[model samples]
Target: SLLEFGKMILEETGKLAIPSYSSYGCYCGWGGKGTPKDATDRCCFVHDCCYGNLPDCNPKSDRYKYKRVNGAIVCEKGTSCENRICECDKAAAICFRQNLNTYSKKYMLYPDFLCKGELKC
Candidate 1:
């Protein structure tokens, strides 16, 4: 995973910072909270909001277990729960590209601390 790979490379260079997914909004990372830093971040935020809607199953049992269709790893369409999550992720991917100009190596891992509080729900 790119997350692990990035962490490993940073670790080798003595950088101890770690990427975080937050209850925050209006910032960076996969957190649904407030007005985003930009729409691309909003796509990341959606990656969180949809899953807490799971009512018929244990949300803790879920994880993005995927398979490689050809050159990319893809989450398998195993059930409605995951299928719905897949749709959210699919939208995220599309939305990120739509706002692709806002993405960069720096912003991908940057947070300006606008929405740093814990969420109420």
Candidate 2:
């Protein structure tokens, strides 16, 4: 029977568990081919590149203060560097996000670490 054959195949080959967050998994070609969410999912690919390569001209600088905004890290305001007008040096945040997007696009052939062990379909 078809069901019996399917069971045999499953038992013999095992399952390749691809999670929703995997770039090559279920949501790969759906919606936009490669969406911003795809980039956001793999944003950490450039963590060291972003935070580690920041300027060190001033050790006591508050301009490099980071905070999470909408799940993405950004420069914090309200400090001497930014003042209370919400104006801050967004170069680091922009650099990180840009690099993250680039890395995500480059690594679209693999699964994200966060989606390990979970099945997409």
> What's the alpha carbon RMSD for model 1?
7.3
Best by TM-score: 1
lDDT of 1 at 17: 23
Compose the digit string of candidate 1's lDDT tens values, residues 1-121: 2333223224322332234222223544444454555565565565456545666644334444444466343566567766565555544444544664654444544555655545432
Clashes of 1: 0
Compared with the true structure, what per-residue lDDT tens digits does model 2 show for residues 71-107?
5434354444333111212332243335433334443
**Candidate 2 segments whose C-alpha is farther than 4 A from its true place:** 1-60, 63-65, 74-77, 83-89, 100-121
Q: Give the root-mean-square deviation of each candidate in angstroms.
A: 7.3, 18.9
Worst 10 residues of 1 by lDDT: 16-25
* lDDT scores of the candidates, listed in order: 0.47, 0.31
Candidate 1, residue 94: CA error in Å? 0.7
Residue pairs in clash, model 2: none
- The weakest ten consecutive residues by lDDT in model 2 span 84-93
